[PDB]
Amino acid sequence: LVGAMDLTFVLPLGLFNPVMERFAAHAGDLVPAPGHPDPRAFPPRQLFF
């Protein structure tokens, strides 16, 4: 009666956002120290679980 499930998962690594959907709400929030460029604006190469 103690059973066993299976589940398979789908995760995207290196996608890019659709052109009409990219922004930063409630204006620019995740801002580094001045004089340092945004690491956010580069195309992503990572994930976190």
């Binding site: 009409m20 959907e21 922004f23 709400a25």
Partner: protein
């Protein structure tokens, strides 16, 4: 057939502007820039669907 009306749906023209609808009717953004949103008047309003 009686009223000769056709009910509107929950719909917007940009998806980022759309996502204030699923929070509820109160926090929905009616208009941000040249885009717009339409929240429904259908009798299926308060349903699970």
């Amino acid at each position: 057939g009686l009223f000769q009306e056709a009910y509107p749906l929950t719909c917007a023209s940009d998806p980022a502007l759309l996502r204030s609808a699923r929070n509820g009717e109160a926090h929905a953004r009616e208009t941000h820039f040249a885009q717009y949103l339409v929240y429904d008047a259908s009798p299926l309003k308060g349903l699970a669907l």
